Amino acid sequence: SFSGYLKLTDNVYIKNADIVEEAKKVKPTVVVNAANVYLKHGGGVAGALNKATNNAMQVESDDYIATNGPLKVGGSCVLSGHNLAKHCLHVVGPNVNKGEDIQLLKSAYENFNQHEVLLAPLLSAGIFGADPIHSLRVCVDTVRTNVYLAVFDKNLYDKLVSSF
Numbered sequence: 720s721f722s723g724y725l726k727l728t729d730n731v732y733i734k735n736a737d738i739v740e741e742a743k744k745v746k747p748t749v750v751v752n753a754a755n756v757y758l759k760h761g762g763g764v765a766g767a768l769n770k771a772t773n774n775a776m777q778v779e780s781d782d783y784i785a786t787n788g789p790l791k792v793g794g795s796c797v798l799s800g801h802n803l804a805k806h807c808l809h810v811v812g813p814n815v816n817k818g819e820d821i822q823l824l825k826s827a828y829e830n831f832n833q834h835e836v837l838l839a840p841l842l843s844a845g846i847f848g849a850d851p852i853h854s855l856r857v858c859v860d861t862v863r864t865n866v867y868l869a870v871f872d873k874n875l876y877d878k879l880v881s882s883f
Contacts, residue, residue, distance in 0.1 A: 724867055738768070739771045742768070743803060746804060748805045754811050756789040758784055793811060796808075808834060812843035813847070837865070841855055
């Protein structure tokens with residue numbers, strides 16, 4: 720199970736970790752991907768998770784999009800976790816750099832409530848452009864299931880913990 724996490728609340732835990740390394744170590748039931756509506760895993764967490772699967776996540780995702788069309792911002796889909804987890808929950812947080820409504824971040828986090836335990840990044844953080852402090856606040860106030868947050872940057876991790 721999950722080790723080295725700081726407990727923030729009854730159900731939210733946080734660690735300064737590379738989510739790829741964390742997933743390979745833990746092999747959790749669910750790893751969350753910071754997806755976009757097209758499931759194009761080019762960069763950020765998605766690019767890193769996809770690279771760890773040797774592009775198998777992207778091949779599976781392209782078939783999913785060809786069949787179902789794009790996801791909604793705030794929506795999700797469950798696909799294979801490949802070599803990282805049993806399942807990958809691809810969740811689309813709003814991308815502030817695309818002018819998407821930050822209010823959709825709560826809807827994005829609500830997808831986590833369909834899974835008892837998840838390894839996840841902060842939604843809409845990083846290249847999605849939202850304030851990670853705000854993302855953590857929405858996470859804590861929305862997710863009721865057990866979420867283990869992996870924050871790649873030590874400096875950001877320290878800021879998130881110290882300001883919680």
